[PDB]
Design a protein around this ligand. Structure first.
Ligand SMILES: O=C(O)CNC(=O)Cc1csc(-c2ccc3ccccc3c2)n1
Length: 325
């Protein structure tokens, strides 16, 4: 049966029963832009389709959502750099991509960010990319390691941007509270009107902090769980599994250890619980995770070692199924 190629930095979005996989890169360039891979969470079978229309460039680090079987794609890194273009693919009724001429001030061109979905709003936070074209709300910190290797320097931001799907208009909310530090390769998860974010890379650390932005008031809150917390990391996944639990898997520590640990964050108790699973010998970073209607968390792709050593990188095509409910 047909089987998608290994990759990291891809996107994966789900309607609870089907998982849509697009993009990413591997070793041994970018996976083909026109392909969309569909994994049936109930039958474990893959199915590939060719998409047409305004097919986005081949990219790593893009940020995607699925809302009522409409897929939206923002940002990423292609052969000629980062982007801030916005695409839509309606997976309801050959599938055609639409590139949206958004109104308003878009985010800076960037990748490795996250998104919360709340009613008509797609809310994007953070990431890695070029200096912004405007003194938009937030801060931006250059990554000094990008000064002497490329032609365009890059850095981290803490920006929050709203894409309103009633009008495809970009805006930025005026927030209160301590926003998280600028960061990339963090993970975001949404429960109700709370947009959680955990970890990420910033300057010389991969972080262990946990915050949530209230998506109704726009007030930041930093969460301080008691007792043992997971080690700081980037390139991990964070996924809602109930109205009270976020599921964490994998990532990459400050001192460059690939991770195979898994935790559940209980929101009501403000406590982490380590989760026991049979994939302890399968660390993953820059994988994706999607929750199914059937209580599972489906992890796909990602790299089993330090992907920054690109000629030795072990990118995966495996499906890891976590039975959290
Ligand atoms: O460092 C983190 O945890 C997340 N990264 C950042 O925040 C910014 C950054 C700075 S360089 C880089 C990066 C990414 C992927 C690569 C894949 C192959 C080869 C080199 C690669 C280099 N990313």
């Amino acid at each position: 049966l047909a089987c998608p190629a290994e990759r990291s930095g891809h996107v994966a979005v789900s309607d609870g029963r089907h998982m849509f996989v697009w993009g990413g890169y591997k070793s041994n360039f970018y996976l083909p832009r026109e392909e969309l891979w569909i994994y049936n969470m109930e039958t474990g079978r893959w199915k590939k389709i060719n998409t047409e229309g305004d097919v986005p460039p081949s990219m790593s680090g893009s940020c995607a959502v699925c809302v009522d079987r409409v897929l939206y794609l923002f940002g990423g890194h292609h052969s000629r750099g980062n982007t801030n273009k916005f695409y839509m693919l309606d997976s309801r009724s050959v599938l055609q991509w639409e590139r949206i001429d958004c109104q308003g001030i878009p985010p800076s061109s960037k990748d490795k960010l996250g998104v919360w979905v709340y009613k008509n709003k797609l809310i994007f936070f953070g990431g890695y990319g070029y200096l912004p074209e405007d003194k938009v709300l937030g801060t931006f910190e250059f990554d000094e390691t990008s000064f002497w290797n490329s032609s365009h320097p890059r850095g981290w931001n803490d920006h929050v941007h709203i894409l309103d799907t009633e009008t495809f208009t970009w805006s930025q909310p005026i927030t209160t509270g301590k926003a998280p530090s600028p960061r990339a390769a963090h993970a975001c998860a949404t429960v109700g009107n709370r947009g959680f974010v955990f970890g990420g890379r910033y300057r010389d650390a991969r972080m262990n902090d946990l915050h949530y932005l209230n998506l109704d008031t726009w007030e930041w809150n930093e969460l301080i769980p008691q007792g043992i917390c997971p080690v700081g990391r980037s390139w991990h996944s964070l996924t809602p599994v109930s109205s009270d639990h976020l599921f964490l898997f994998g990532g990459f520590t400050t001192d460059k250890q690939p991770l195979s640990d898994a935790w559940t964050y209980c929101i009501s108790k403000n406590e982490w619980i380590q989760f026991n699973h049979p994939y302890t010998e399968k660390p993953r970073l820059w994988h994706t995770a999607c929750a199914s209607d059937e209580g599972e968390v489906i992890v796909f792709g990602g790299c089993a070692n330090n992907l920054l050593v690109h000629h030795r990188a072990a990118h995966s095509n495996e499906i890891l199924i976590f039975s959290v409910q």
